[PDB]
Write an enzyme that holds these catalytic residues in place. Structure first.
Site, short mmCIF file in Angstrom:
data_model
loop_
_atom_site.label_atom_id
_atom_site.label_comp_id
_atom_site.label_asym_id
_atom_site.label_seq_id
_atom_site.Cartn_x
_atom_site.Cartn_y
_atom_site.Cartn_z
N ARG A 1 3.37 -12.13 0.51
CA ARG A 1 2.02 -12.59 0.88
C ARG A 1 1.67 -13.98 0.42
O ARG A 1 2.21 -14.48 -0.59
CB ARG A 1 0.93 -11.65 0.31
N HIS B 1 -11.55 -3.15 11.68
CA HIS B 1 -10.30 -3.87 11.39
C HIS B 1 -10.08 -4.83 12.56
O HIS B 1 -9.20 -4.62 13.41
CB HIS B 1 -9.15 -2.86 11.27
N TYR C 1 -0.66 -4.28 -6.61
CA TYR C 1 -0.41 -4.93 -5.32
C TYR C 1 -1.57 -4.87 -4.33
O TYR C 1 -2.16 -3.83 -4.13
CB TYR C 1 0.85 -4.38 -4.64
N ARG D 1 0.84 -1.22 0.00
CA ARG D 1 0.00 0.00 0.00
C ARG D 1 0.86 1.25 0.00
O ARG D 1 1.94 1.28 0.63
CB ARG D 1 -0.95 0.07 1.22
N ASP E 1 -9.27 -10.50 9.86
CA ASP E 1 -8.90 -9.15 9.42
C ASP E 1 -10.00 -8.08 9.51
O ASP E 1 -9.77 -7.00 10.07
CB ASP E 1 -8.32 -9.16 8.01
N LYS F 1 -9.39 -3.63 1.58
CA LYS F 1 -9.33 -2.46 2.48
C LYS F 1 -10.16 -1.31 1.96
O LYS F 1 -10.86 -0.64 2.73
CB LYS F 1 -7.86 -2.00 2.68
N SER G 1 -0.37 -3.34 13.45
CA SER G 1 0.92 -3.96 13.07
C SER G 1 0.93 -5.50 13.16
O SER G 1 1.98 -6.13 13.07
CB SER G 1 2.07 -3.37 13.90
N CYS H 1 -1.54 -6.84 11.29
CA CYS H 1 -2.39 -6.97 10.10
C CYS H 1 -1.68 -7.91 9.13
O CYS H 1 -0.57 -7.64 8.71
CB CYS H 1 -2.64 -5.59 9.48
#
Ligand SMILES: [Mn+2]
Length: 596
Positions: free
Chosen positions: A391, A250, A221, A72, A297, A230, A272, A274
């Site tokens: 990921r 979240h 990405y 991000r 999440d 998100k 952090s 996540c």
């Protein structure tokens, strides 16, 4: 994949044709979510050079990205609203950088779009992805249509959301329009890096809630391109939630079952953490207790007619940070990613498997590695084999401990909400709020030292002060069975620099105490900061040497500094947009600390 668009309802068709006229793709393909479509996508991606097969495994694949497109891009992510104050509080008056979101005017946004999108899909197929956030028949589900020129995005969206017949059948005027392009029209004028098209210098990830729209340009990405992830599930959804009387958060959601057979669900917001290993996939270290994963999440939550806070997981897959994942730390995640998984930016081994720091998969001697940059790699290289933000993307139904109700359209009743932090001193292992407003203050005061209120800092969809106001108002619902609110800290250090608390499966001991507090058990003692377990009511049996007093510090100096920092934080970043009730909770804490 089909060129026939007849099955799209009128508003979705209009959106697609608008995007086609703008982007000028070579063809238009409607996605159906099928196994055959997945195979076709994979075939094209391998032929394109984007995906490497991983023949060590059952149907796993590896993508690598341009090093300029690996995460991000917060500075290029914006909220588009006519009035700046609808999006964000006043800029910090002392001149510090805004931290609660970026605003862009409609005028500026439209000009940015006209520089980027016209002709951006020249030579490429445009893919149409009708999708549902949540089980499509859930009263809490929300629909979207994402158009993209990235087959990688299509493959990942199919894993992370519901794409399929059930979605098209339900689609009407009310859906989120999601427009995405990697921003590399054909013909290319130079080679790609790792076959990965992007336009890093012009990345723009925009959210336009008044138009039910997300517009994302220049990145392939994760959080930038998988528009459910998100952009929809937090930014657009949070503003919808504020308008419609629900919460988009979240938070992981887990089910906890006691030895004697009672089950309670809990949600938890960790900053952090996540994408990282958490409570949701935990193997408990207390005999008889069970943990099931609902989500790890995003949580969408709404009070039902009986006043119970019902949550759904609006995702269908896990998009997890790979480095640090191992059978030792997270065997459930390891099971989840063993098959049908797409890996991005991890290392590639000579035996056709994957590699990242921390991985413990047995490999034969002499196995060698290629980094995410496509270079030979050996232990001791200054750079990690896998990018730190690399990921896995895997279907959630492969997780061995998924809750039976993880995709139940009715949602699961939430009895506790837990805020997390990571602090070497001062903040106890677990504390319970004295009431709703006090709990909202605790969430507002979370740290990551960066402040990360409700773990939502990068993800607000509207003025963060009004978000806090929305949480306060939610507690006023008549006859609501409000969950109890807690703050936890697994990471206190001893007078020797090592962790006081063993964590991992032992975190079930904290959940067990929480479980008892839900049931109304008299197992707490009061402190200036909230309720804490009485010594002996937190199960430390089987943990010899663990010192309760170091788990529950009550340090006046620490709290005086914590209050000074919070006061400055609120003053600079929220100002007059901070709800009075939050300031009142800080003032209360200051006064209790004064007397301690
Ligand atoms: Mn997250």
């Amino acid at each position: 994949l089909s060129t026939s668009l007849s099955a799209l309802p009128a508003a979705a068709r209009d959106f697609v044709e608008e995007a086609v006229r703008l982007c000028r793709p070579r063809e238009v393909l409607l996605c159906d979510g099928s196994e055959e479509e997945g195979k076709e996508l994979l075939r094209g991606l391998q032929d394109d050079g984007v995906l490497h097969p991983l023949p060590k495994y059952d149907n796993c694949w590896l993508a690598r990205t341009d090093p300029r497109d690996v995460a991000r891009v917060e500075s290029k992510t914006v909220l588009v609203t006519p009035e700046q104050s609808d999006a964000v509080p006043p800029p910090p008056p002392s001149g510090g950088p805004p931290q609660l979101g970026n605003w862009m005017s409609p005028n500026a946004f439209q000009a940015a779009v006209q520089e980027r999108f016209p002709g951006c899909m020249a030579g490429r197929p445009l893919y149409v992805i009708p999708f549902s956030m949540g089980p499509p028949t859930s009263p809490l589900a929300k629909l979207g249509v994402q158009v993209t020129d990235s087959p990688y995005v299509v493959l990942s969206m199919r894993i992370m959301t519901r794409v399929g017949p059930a979605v098209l059948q339900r689609l009407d005027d009310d859906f989120v329009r999601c427009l995405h392009s990697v921003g590399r029209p054909l013909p290319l004028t130079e080679p790609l890096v790792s076959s990965w098209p992007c336009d890093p210098s012009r990345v723009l990830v925009a959210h336009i809630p008044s138009e039910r729209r997300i517009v994302s340009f220049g990145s392939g990405y994760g959080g930038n391109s998988l528009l459910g992830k998100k952009c929809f599930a937090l930014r657009i959804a949070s503003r919808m939630a504020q308008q419609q009387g629900w919460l988009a958060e979240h938070m992981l959601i887990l089910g906890v079952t006691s030895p004697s057979g009672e089950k309670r669900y809990m949600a938890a917001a960790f900053p952090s953490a996540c994408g990282k290993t958490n409570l949701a996939m935990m193997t408990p270290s207390l005999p008889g207790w069970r943990i099931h994963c609902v989500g790890d999440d995003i949580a969408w939550m709404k009070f039902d007619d009986e006043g119970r806070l019902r949550a759904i997981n609006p995702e269908r897959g896990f998009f997890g940070v790979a480095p640090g994942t191992s059978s030792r730390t997270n065997p459930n995640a390891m099971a989840t990613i063993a098959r049908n998984t797409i890996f991005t930016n991890v290392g590639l081994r000579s035996d056709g498997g994957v590699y990242w720091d921390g991985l413990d998969e047995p490999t034969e001697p002499g196995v060698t590695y290629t980094s995410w940059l496509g270079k030979p790699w050996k232990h001791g290289d200054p750079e990690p084999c896998a990018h730190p933000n690399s990921r896995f993307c895997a279907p959630a139904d492969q997780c061995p401990i998924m809750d039976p109700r993880w995709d139940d359209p009715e949602g699961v009743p939430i009895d506790a909400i837990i805020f997390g932090g990571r602090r070497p001193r001062g903040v106890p292992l677990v504390v319970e709020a004295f009431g709703w407003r006090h709990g909202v203050f605790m969430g507002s005061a979370m740290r990551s030292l960066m402040h990360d209120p409700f773990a939502m800092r990068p993800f607000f969809g509207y003025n963060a002060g009004r978000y806090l106001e929305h949480w306060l108002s939610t507690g006023l619902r008549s006859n609501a069975r409000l969950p109890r609110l807690f703050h936890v800290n697994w990471f206190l250090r001893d007078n020797e620099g090592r962790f006081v608390w063993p964590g991992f499966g032992h975190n079930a001991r904290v959940l067990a105490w929480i479980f008892g507090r839900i049931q109304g058990r008299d197992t707490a003692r009061p402190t200036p900061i909230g309720w804490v377990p009485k010594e002996g009511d937190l199960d430390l049996g089987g943990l010899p040497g663990v010192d309760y007093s170091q788990l529950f510090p009550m340090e006046k100096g620490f709290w005086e500094e914590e209050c000074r920092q919070l006061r400055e934080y609120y003053g600079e970043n929220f100002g007059a947009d901070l709800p009075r009730d939050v300031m009142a909770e800080l003032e209360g804490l200051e006064e209790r600390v004064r007397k301690m």
